[PDB]
Design a protein around this ligand. Structure first.
Ligand SMILES: [Mn+2]
Ligand SMILES: [Mn+2]
Ligand SMILES: [Mn+2]
Ligand SMILES: [Mn+2]
Lengths: 495, 494
């Protein structure tokens, strides 16, 4: 549970709510927080349009996304791709004063969106960023699915090593723990049909990457079918792949409503989590397969990450966004990987339907224009309160969930009881209106940049310092820490 | 066609288009115009949220609408109804410097939206404003459909005479030419079912108004059926009512997509225009009926106004807004009122489907999320280019259509050939971001107040001066005039 101490600037409505009162008074433009303290922040040249966060050592990388739209060709988007667009390199050697140092604006890094990852492996420091909108059928070379691969041995000055062109649109990338492979998801155009897969790129030689192939899911009957994974995480020894899956070509993963719909009938589906045996690739077997070991239905289509809670292996999975009551993370016990089981769920008060109905300025029932001219309630013109990524503090020794909830800001969750996750803290960064990459009312995500902000990035926990790193669309890159009281309570070590 | 000459600041893209290049460069925040010049303007305490324009003599009345939403109870919306919300009284005695003088904030005027009209009749000047959102079933008395009635004998200081409670939601009001009756449309909750009607209120004593009843449409078969008129206009002798009609209970009238749908294929349908014989009410017959004289299919559901073009009686009707390719006015010949005939259409290039397609950043066929996660093209994030009201310069001697096109600004159209209306001028006011009534990204109309403005009001032409009055959502009240060149070519007096 969350205790309010003198340090805090707590939420003024329901848990996770941005109240219309605060929007009108201007209060919503300033931060809210409990259980945490801001260490440092940079608005990254006041740019806006921030999305993904990756890191190598003491350097953060923050991608950008264009208002022109998720799938719009980069060649048609020059008005939205000039500086300060691109992946910003941020010096965090002093976390009280993070400092943006340069912009990567190569084919993959100019509009990386969700398609960026970095890894510090033994003797290999790598940053990759890809053209999230690239490779859509019928376009030319300029608009292909480019992947820019950087040697980040000097993390403050990543050196472009090569640019590889995928044979399909790649949505998210995950570099293997040894830094020598990149796993790229294909969700488009298959989407709900499940006709996509997981691409593998060998980047042992960063200057000369070698395409491995497009993988489907292989079942015990020996047959392979497509799937459309959104993102994968990878086990420590690379022998397990944990896929968050939107759909299967076998058709047994139900697909639901648009996560950007404002209201309000059909629901968003959670999608499934697949655990995949990746031993074939690890051991260099010919005709390699990715074999289905187990499946957690409703496990979460958007992101899944590994966790170890009191010595017991778990996964944390979630869908994303969604109109009220939105979407939220689920805790999945994988002690038996052949039979994963959802053991707990973490939800805010704003993820309860009854609550969402109670705050509306007008009840759906009273709306004569309902089918005729659908108009969202004013409470739905702020931004979704639902997951967008769902990380943990330490995969190998997990206590805390670090859960971005988009307009709900970043939620800090005690996971020590996996059947009963509870909030212990949160940070909402306020607002930063009129930025170059998020201004002009041209946004497409439903985030209202005039009055609030949205946290959409992966979240880092640094055990040495206790610092938590995250990026928010308009306010930029933040470093926060737990307050002394909460830290003492969690019995985290102390330095 | 628009002669672009000195003093003009032309549109840069297709006719009616707000170009993404201009949004990004900031050019969209400044006015565009051809054929006209600005005489004067007031931003009305820089308030935003303006909608309807009415007038008496040298005073303008401008309504507001709240961000809380079209049908949200006023009692639940106090955060959106603080000053400067309300009907603003504007002194236009000096058109070069119109001045906001007063704010009317009674039950009907606090949030009037489209529901406001004023008339200057012999021995009577009257302004009425009604709670557009009032009278939804299951609410308290404070949230009823109130109509505030003002004696505007002194147009700068309208005096509240009474507040009348309609027995249903009333959407638009039209005062009769003699100033003695108010015609109020009921479109909610019936909407597409056609189950509504036309309410009539006697206001000959403004302090003691008397309800005359709710009327349907009576046909030759002797039956009366409901209809949902959005707005009516009335003939000079009140014996004819021209109704813009969304739907009929007889179901003959095509009802289509949402006017506010972002990016949809399915077009907004035009609805129908009904000509109604109103002689029963005029002559004071008991159990009065409104009898269908004629019907113009596709005539326009939103607004219809009379026009006289080279001595021949016409109507100009239109639907409203809508995604590309939007909605646009139609010219209707009613020389035979029993058989109204659409004879012309005024369309902008932005009302052509193939142009709408050509400006998209991404073609529909290239979007794999098209059904799965529908997302409007960036070109659809500015505001509809489609009619919102569709007036003429002088109903009795018509030369020009004065056509608000929302994000398209106000279009000035040569109607002298009713089969071939042609544009001769326009004014787009630019942008006025961060107003208290239109700011904070809380709009529901689809208007992007950060980079453009929306023209939604009725439009006044003053024959004596040549001045044209209109209101825009964020930029406020404007007075413009035709160029000397335009006036001469069109054959206007001097
Ligand atoms: Mn994605
Ligand atoms: Mn996402
Ligand atoms: Mn209306
Ligand atoms: Mn309207």
């Amino acid at each position: 549970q969350v205790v309010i101490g003198p340090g805090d600037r707590p939420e003024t409505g329901l848990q996770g709510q941005t109240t219309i009162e605060d929007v009108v008074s201007g209060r919503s433009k300033l931060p809210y927080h409990a259980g945490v303290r801001l260490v440092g922040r940079t608005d990254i040249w006041n740019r806006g349009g921030n999305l993904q966060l990756s890191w190598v050592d003491q350097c953060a990388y923050v991608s950008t996304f264009k208002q022109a739209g998720p799938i719009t060709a980069n060649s048609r988007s020059a008005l939205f791709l000039r500086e300060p667009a691109g992946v910003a390199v941020i010096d965090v050697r002093d976390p009280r004063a993070p400092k943006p140092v340069r912009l990567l604006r190569d084919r993959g890094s100019i509009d990386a969106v969700e398609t960026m990852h970095a890894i510090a492996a033994p003797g290999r420091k790598v940053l990759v960023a890809g053209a999230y909108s690239g490779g859509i059928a019928g376009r030319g070379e300029e608009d292909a699915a480019w992947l820019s691969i950087y040697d980040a041995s000097n993390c403050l000055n990543p050196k472009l090593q090569s640019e590889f062109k995928w044979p399909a649109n790649i949505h998210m990338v995950t570099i293997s723990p040894n830094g020598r492979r990149v796993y790229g998801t294909e969700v488009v155009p298959g989407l709900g049909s499940g006709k996509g897969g997981l691409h593998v790129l060998d980047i042992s030689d960063m200057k000369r990457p070698r395409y491995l192939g497009r993988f489907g899911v292989t079942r015990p009957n020996g047959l392979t079918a497509g799937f459309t994974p959104h993102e994968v995480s990878i086990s420590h020894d690379e022998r397990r792949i944990y896929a968050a899956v939107l759909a299967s070509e076998t058709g047994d993963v139900p697909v639901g409503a648009s996560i950007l719909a404002s209201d309000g009938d059909v629901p968003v589906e959670n999608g499934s989590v697949y655990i995949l045996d990746n031993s074939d690739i690890v051991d260099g077997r010919s005709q390699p397969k990715m074999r289905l070991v187990g499946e957690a239905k409703q496990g979460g289509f958007h992101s899944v990450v590994p966790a170890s809670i009191n010595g017991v292996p778990h996964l944390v999975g979630a869908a994303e966004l969604g109109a009220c009551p939105g979407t939220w993370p689920r805790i999945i016990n994988i002690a038996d990987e052949k039979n994963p089981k959802i053991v707990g769920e973490f939800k805010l008060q704003m993820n309860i339907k009854e609550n969402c109905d109670a705050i509306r300025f007008t009840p759906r029932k009273e709306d004569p224009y309902a089918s005729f001219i659908p108009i969202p309630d004013i409470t739905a013109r702020l931004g979704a309160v639902g997951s967008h990524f769902n990380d943990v503090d330490d995969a190998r020794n997990t206590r805390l969930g670090l859960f971005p909830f988009f307009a709900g800001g970043v939620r800090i969750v005690d996971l020590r009881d996996p059947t009963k996750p509870v909030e212990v803290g949160y940070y909402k960064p306020g607002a930063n209106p009129d930025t170059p990459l998020s201004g002009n009312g041209l946004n497409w995500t439903g985030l209202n940049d005039q009055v609030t902000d949205g946290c959409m990035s992966h979240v880092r926990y640094v055990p040495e310092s206790g610092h938590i790193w995250f990026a928010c669309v308009t306010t930029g890159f933040h470093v926060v820490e737990l307050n002394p009281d909460l830290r003492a309570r969690l019995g985290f070590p102390t330095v």
